[PDB]
Amino acid sequence: SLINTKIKPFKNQAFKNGEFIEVTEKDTEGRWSVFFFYPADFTFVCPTELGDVADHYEELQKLGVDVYSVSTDTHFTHKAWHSSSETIAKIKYAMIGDPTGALTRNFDNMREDEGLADRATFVVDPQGIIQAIEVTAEGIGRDASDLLRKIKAAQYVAAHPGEVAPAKWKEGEATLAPSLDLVGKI
Amino acid sequence: SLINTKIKPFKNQAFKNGEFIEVTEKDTEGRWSVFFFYPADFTFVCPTELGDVADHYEELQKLGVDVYSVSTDTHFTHKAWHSSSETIAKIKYAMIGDPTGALTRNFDNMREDEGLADRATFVVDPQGIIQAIEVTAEGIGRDASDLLRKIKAAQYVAAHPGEVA
Amino acid sequence: SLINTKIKPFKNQAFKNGEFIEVTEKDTEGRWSVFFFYPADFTFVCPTELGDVADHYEELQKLGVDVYSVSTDTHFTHKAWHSSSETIAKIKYAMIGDPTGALTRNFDNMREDEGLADRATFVVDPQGIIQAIEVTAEGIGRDASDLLRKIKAAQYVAAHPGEVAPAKWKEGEATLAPSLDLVGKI
Amino acid sequence: SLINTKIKPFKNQAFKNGEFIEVTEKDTEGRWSVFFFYPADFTFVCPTELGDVADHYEELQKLGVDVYSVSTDTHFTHKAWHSSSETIAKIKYAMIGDPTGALTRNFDNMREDEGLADRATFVVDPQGIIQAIEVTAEGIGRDASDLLRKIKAAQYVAAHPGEVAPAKWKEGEATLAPSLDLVGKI
Amino acid sequence: SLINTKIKPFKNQAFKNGEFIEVTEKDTEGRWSVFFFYPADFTFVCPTELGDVADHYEELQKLGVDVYSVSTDTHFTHKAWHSSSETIAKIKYAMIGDPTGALTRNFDNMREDEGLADRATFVVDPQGIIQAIEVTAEGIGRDASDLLRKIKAAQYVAAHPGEVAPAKWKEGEATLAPSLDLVGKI
Amino acid sequence: SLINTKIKPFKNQAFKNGEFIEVTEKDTEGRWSVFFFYPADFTFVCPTELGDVADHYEELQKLGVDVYSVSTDTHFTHKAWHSSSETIAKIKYAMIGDPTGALTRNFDNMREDEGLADRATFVVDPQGIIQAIEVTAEGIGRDASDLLRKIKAAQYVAAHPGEVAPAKWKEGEATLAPSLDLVGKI
Amino acid sequence: SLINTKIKPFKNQAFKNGEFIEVTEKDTEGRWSVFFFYPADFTFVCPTELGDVADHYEELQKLGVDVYSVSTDTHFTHKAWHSSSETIAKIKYAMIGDPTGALTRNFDNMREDEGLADRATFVVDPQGIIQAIEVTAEGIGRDASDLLRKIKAAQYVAAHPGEVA
Amino acid sequence: SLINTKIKPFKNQAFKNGEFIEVTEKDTEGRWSVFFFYPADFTFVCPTELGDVADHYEELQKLGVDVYSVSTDTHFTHKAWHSSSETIAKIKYAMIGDPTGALTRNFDNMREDEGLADRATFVVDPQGIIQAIEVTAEGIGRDASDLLRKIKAAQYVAAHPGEVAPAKWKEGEATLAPSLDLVGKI
Amino acid sequence: SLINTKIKPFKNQAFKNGEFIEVTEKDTEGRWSVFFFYPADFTFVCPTELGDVADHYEELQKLGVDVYSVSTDTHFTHKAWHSSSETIAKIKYAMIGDPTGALTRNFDNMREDEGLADRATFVVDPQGIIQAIEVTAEGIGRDASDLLRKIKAAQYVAAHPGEVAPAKWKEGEATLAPSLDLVGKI
Amino acid sequence: SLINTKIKPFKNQAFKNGEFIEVTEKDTEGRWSVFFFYPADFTFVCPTELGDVADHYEELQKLGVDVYSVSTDTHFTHKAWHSSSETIAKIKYAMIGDPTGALTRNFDNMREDEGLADRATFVVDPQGIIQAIEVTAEGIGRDASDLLRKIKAAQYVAAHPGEVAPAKWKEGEATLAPSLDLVGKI
Ligand SMILES: [Cl-]
Ligand SMILES: [Cl-]
Ligand SMILES: [K+]
Ligand SMILES: [K+]
Ligand SMILES: [K+]
Ligand SMILES: [K+]
Ligand SMILES: [K+]
């Protein structure tokens, strides 16, 4: 999989808080990033997953995490969706348009026979390495709280090399210190 | 990704409740399955995660879900690990050995420079279709409760396609 | 060159008069067809050209001509655009979504570096043969009346094989009949 | 697709106002150029279209636009035709001969089974970029008035970048100024 | 060289005595044929040669020989030239138009850099076998009396097999009988 | 065809007036040359043709024209034939032997199934450019008077550039001056 | 075969006398080496053979010979096996883990359909040259005394090239 | 390695007890075989390894094991060596000559830059599967008694499937019975 | 290498005792054949060798051996040579002409830079198998007596399979009978 | 064909007069060399030919000619053969072993299906050029006296470049001098 690989260069237009901006990989350097892919704008389902990320966005920015939602629609479409839907209107992070499919293909996330991205979330660290990946079928919700947890854990191992976060790890809980004597002990 | 693709045929030995059994894709037919990959027996993060899945195993079995843990170690090694660790001894689901690495590569989950599988979880429906995928870096834990929630969502949308807004 | 070539098979979803439908090359067999490509929904030059075609749609249907607008946006986006623009709301012809870009490539009409189609119009006869092509750069509008004139002329020539319609030909004006005697005499 | 691509180099003999001249792409640089392809000298639809362009050549020159008609006949034949037809006699622009077919193939406009060019018109700006294309079937005549309209719109857009001419736009009519604000409003 | 090879199939339009016709390889079956290539209509050297052939056309028809002049101009152009020039107006043989160059290339007679044929003459027998070739350079005119001489000699060789026409063979002169005894005796 | 191409380099042994010599492309530089190919020594038709050329050899030498007869036999064989035949004994020009076939193939004149050259004559100018070609079939003899006619005409064209020899041009007859005014006047 | 070829570069983790160490070809330079491959930890034939080499290890060390056992299991597994079996606990030479299988394939010794090494022994001289090779089927035992004899013969011919008839 | 693979077909001449015979793989079917390779006949070293096998040959035949020694010399050379050396004279098994190198290459045992086989011994069971392999450098003796041991062990596991022979196994000694309960126990 | 390979099919014209004949491989079947290649007719070393074979042709015919001399000259040249040289005049065997070089290349005997065959002699048995080859440099003569010796030995060996003729073997001398017993004894 | 080609580089071990040596192409530079190939040591026809060459070895060394016998056997085998055959014991020239077959393939002399060389002899001059080749089938012996004759002739021609040695030429007999006058006169 693309776990533990570096993200590839990209250049896309985006809608962000009433403005059109350009995003490239250079904007991700030195930062934590979340690439949040979804198939299409303006479908008949409430865009809850994106709204749930927007609800957590202040906290994600406090942790220095930037969020980019991505679909193969244009930034023009994103802007109209943002005006037409109260849920989407809550989004203050960048909505990237990827009509060439190139960003989606960099993350190996294209449904080629449909021309739409799959429902994938990628966590990328400040050096561009992918640290977590989540892909679900339609109807299987992506929980923004499990995403926050994973990010906090990724930030923790980065700040404490020599330690690993066991299952269900949360802040305050015990970590493990990989060693010879710990081999076969747990 | 492999989302929404059918799992590939496989044939592997496993340790399960004190015996060595053979597992193939025919054992997954008509059942919900969780393929739980981890890098290596006799290490550290791997057992807490495996133990957390063992703690929910009764519940997963009430939902018609089978669990298969997979690493590139042999079934011999799993048996030995099951006898020596208190956390692993709780496991009652099948521990598959994948020394040729074929099952891992079928799930595109190999660390090729280490010969070990990445920390990946796959939810596979009764038709062999992969419905959820999770992969994390060495040190970021999986949450068995989030896995359960997803499995319940997957079962619900299968039973009731189209219930949305 | 796609002039005097046969259209290739396609299968696309479309928005037409409040519903979603499938459109394929078989729906064009036996009919006159206009494939009207444009780059993106929710932009500026695109709606005026599409509305202008919607104004001639009653006349075109009386001539047996079906209209298909095409962009690489999805059919969901078309529907949304249709509900929010007064200009697009008057479209009663099929709005095809081509997110894989396969129909656009069939017509060799993709801006590959943008993932959007160019501003191209094609006139296709009942046998699937393209009889007229028009392509313009981003800021130059098309004129549906010139489009109509070309369709009428195309119909005449199909209906009168040993005749040809000269420059600026309108219904009822003097046509020419290619022969040995007429050679070099105009 | 040739829209928005640069014309290729060429070198051809042409008949222009009683003399044979050489035309190359260097003659087109810094000028607006119309390449008017037609299938054959001493035929029927071909002269009426060429005469119609001649009727507008005074205005086109006034706007800095050069015209080049092109067929696979030789420049010798164009001269004989100029002398024998009262319509061709009024042509004051260069009548290019393309017997190798090289210029016709640069514009991808050969009828390979006939060795004759198709009825295509290309509008080229001072930088060599193709801004408008029109191709019609053998029996359908082109309309010089619509060619004029397009040239004027292409010239306007060159001069007012950030503006675009909507459908049916003519000199002295309202133009659109793309902005974030205007998206989805028309 | 193409001496003693079979002509390849062809299908070309032509002008012959005020009418347009189709010529193919079937029209030459069972007949003797002269393919007279020249570079271009409405030029200078070409008509004098074509006229010289026209003068000898009755004699040729008596010998069962058909003439086919060829250039890469169209049959429309040949008609106009036929009406235009007093030299060309006396041609009663078929003027083939070869705008695709296929017929010229079958006889490996194309000037690929000009798209015009060279000045070549081919004698073809009733079985389609080329028995004589003549190619001269741009500006050197051919002479039909030579052509007739070669034709008469070709026909004798066919009607009297086992004999050969020596240099300067004219009707009534001695012919050689190839044999073992004659080897090195001349 | 090879008309108006430059001869390729060659190196062959030859027999000339009781002596063996080497001939290369350098020996033809600055001179007019006639390459007279024939199929085989000690045959029947070949000597009569070679003799006919021998008769005209003084006239040719006055015009600065050198003769080179060629066959795929060796120079040893040419000598023996020179001693053996009264027709051949009168040849004072160089008899080239081309047993490798390289020289024959440079002139695309090989009968690949026999390993013998066809009956072809090539006129080459001082710059090595072929100005006239003649190929006849096994058994049709060539005529040197024709050859001289083509040679004299080739030389005039070279010494008076901007003029062209019409059909049947002989010394003293009118020549054409290619121009614009003359197009379609003949 | 690989007889008389130079061993290829490698980098692997090993268990040795209670610690994890890294082993590369630089540790073999200037020494006589025995590479002892076996299919899998926590099995049957493998330990008797490994124990027999452990019984001669003091002697092999008196002759300047280093021993490396190799299997496709991890160094973690070797450590666990060393703690649980009385036969393996006697091993004081390095137990190399080869999970990517690179060291095994360098010696052309992989059972590709099992992901396990074949039962092969290689004797490698101080210049990296392979001087003796032995490979046996599953179930045919290696003889550590025959190995010793060969190592002594290899050392003798190296010291005294040409002493024959 | 070739361990546990089937031997490939072969056809070689051999010297055996004063006679020349032919050996193919068909002679190995249903039998145990030992292929004993060695570099060359008639060198300056006493051929002890081959003599040591000859000393054990009666016993090997009682166990139904056939022996074939192989080098790239001819069977002619083997026969002369057998007459000249007392050690070689003891050999009653087949001495195969392999001058094409094909048998040696089937067992991947060629030193290609020398054209001699390496010092390899292969034990092959009645189904053609290689069960043991031994390769040594020069001076490192192959012990025929270790070979007998291996063979007895190979024959034993074949006769008692479900059992394996541990290290140093000899007849009378205990075997192991691969089972789950034995896992990690030894 | 051609020793012990079968001759390839061929079809050539030849001069034999005042007539031209066709020779093919079918003429060689069931006969012993000598293919005597030489570089050129009317040269120096070539006739002395050919005459020497002629001196032995009576004996060769008596032994059922046919002879074929071969060069790249034509059969016409062989006849002229037969008439002019008292040495060649005594040749009663077929003098094959190989102007395509095809027969010479079948025997791999072309001097590719000269288009002449090298001085090679091949002995072919009734089954088409080449049993003896001799090739010499340009200046070295072959000896027909040694050719005879070889033919007689090849015929003896055909007749006494299991026997061989040793060095210097001549009719009625001791021959060897290969056996195991004779190995290493001579 | 290896006639008149240069020998290729080689490096082989040999047995010569009681010792083992290396032989390469450099040992032949500046000397006359005979490469005498034979199939196998310890056989029947081979020794009589080799002994026969050993009988002329004193004469050959007086002529500056070195002899090399070659087989695919090893040099060890040669030595052994040398010690056991009365015939081989008289060989004082180098006996090359070619177990890789590389020298035999250089001379294109391998029986690939046997791994043995054919019965071929090559005469090589001081410049490494092969001047004579002889190959015979398995039972036909070579004659060293014919070999000597060819070497002498080869030496003469090298020593007298404008001369050639005819058929059956022996030292002192009449040689020929190729020239124009001698053509066709023998
Ligand atoms: Cl385009
Ligand atoms: Cl050969
Ligand atoms: K799209
Ligand atoms: K043309
Ligand atoms: K493993
Ligand atoms: K030839
Ligand atoms: K050999």
Curated annotation (Swiss-Prot), chains A, C, D, E, F, H, I, J:
GO terms for biological process: cell redox homeostasis; hydrogen peroxide catabolic process; response to oxidative stress. InterPro entries: AhpC, AhpC/TSA, Peroxiredoxin, Peroxiredoxin_AhpC-typ, Peroxiredoxin_C, Thioredoxin-like_sf, Thioredoxin_domain. The active site is at C46. Its EC number is 1.11.1.26. The keyword Cytoplasm applies. The keyword Ribosomal protein does not apply. SUPFAM superfamilies: Thioredoxin-like (SSF52833). Keywords: Antioxidant, Cytoplasm, Disulfide bond, Oxidoreductase, Peroxidase, Redox-active center. Residues 1-156 form the Thioredoxin domain. It catalyses: a hydroperoxide + NADH + H(+) = an alcohol + NAD(+) + H2O. It holds the Pfam family 1-cysPrx_C. Its main location: cytoplasm. It is found in: Cytoplasm. GO terms for molecular function: NADH-dependent peroxiredoxin activity; thioredoxin peroxidase activity. GO terms for cellular component: cytosol. Belongs to the peroxiredoxin family. AhpC/Prx1 subfamily. PANTHER family: ALKYL HYDROPEROXIDE REDUCTASE C (PTHR10681:SF121), THIOREDOXIN PEROXIDASE (PTHR10681). The active site is a conserved redox-active cysteine residue, the peroxidatic cysteine (C(P)), which makes the nucleophilic attack on the peroxide substrate. The peroxide oxidizes the C(P)-SH to cysteine sulfenic acid (C(P)-SOH), which then reacts with another cysteine residue, the resolving cysteine (C(R)), to form a disulfide bridge. The disulfide is subsequently reduced by an appropriate electron donor to complete the catalytic cycle. In this typical 2-Cys peroxiredoxin, C(R) is provided by the other dimeric subunit to form an intersubunit disulfide. Thiol-specific peroxidase that catalyzes the reduction of hydrogen peroxide and organic hydroperoxides to water and alcohols, respectively. Plays a role in cell protection against oxidative stress by detoxifying peroxides. Homodimer; disulfide-linked, upon oxidation. 5 homodimers assemble to form a ring-like decamer. This is Alkyl hydroperoxide reductase C. It comes from Salmonella typhimurium (strain LT2 / SGSC1412 / ATCC 700720).
From Swiss-Prot, chains B, G:
Its EC number is 1.11.1.26. Keywords: Antioxidant, Cytoplasm, Disulfide bond, Oxidoreductase, Peroxidase, Redox-active center. One of its GO terms (cellular component) is cytosol. InterPro entries: AhpC, AhpC/TSA, Peroxiredoxin, Peroxiredoxin_AhpC-typ, Peroxiredoxin_C, Thioredoxin-like_sf, Thioredoxin_domain. SUPFAM superfamilies: Thioredoxin-like (SSF52833). Residues 1-156 form the Thioredoxin domain. It is found in: Cytoplasm. GO terms for molecular function: NADH-dependent peroxiredoxin activity; thioredoxin peroxidase activity. The keyword Lipid metabolism does not apply. It catalyses: a hydroperoxide + NADH + H(+) = an alcohol + NAD(+) + H2O. The active site is a conserved redox-active cysteine residue, the peroxidatic cysteine (C(P)), which makes the nucleophilic attack on the peroxide substrate. The peroxide oxidizes the C(P)-SH to cysteine sulfenic acid (C(P)-SOH), which then reacts with another cysteine residue, the resolving cysteine (C(R)), to form a disulfide bridge. The disulfide is subsequently reduced by an appropriate electron donor to complete the catalytic cycle. In this typical 2-Cys peroxiredoxin, C(R) is provided by the other dimeric subunit to form an intersubunit disulfide. This is Alkyl hydroperoxide reductase C. It comes from Salmonella typhimurium (strain LT2 / SGSC1412 / ATCC 700720). The lineage of its organism: Bacteria, Pseudomonadati, Pseudomonadota, Gammaproteobacteria, Enterobacterales.
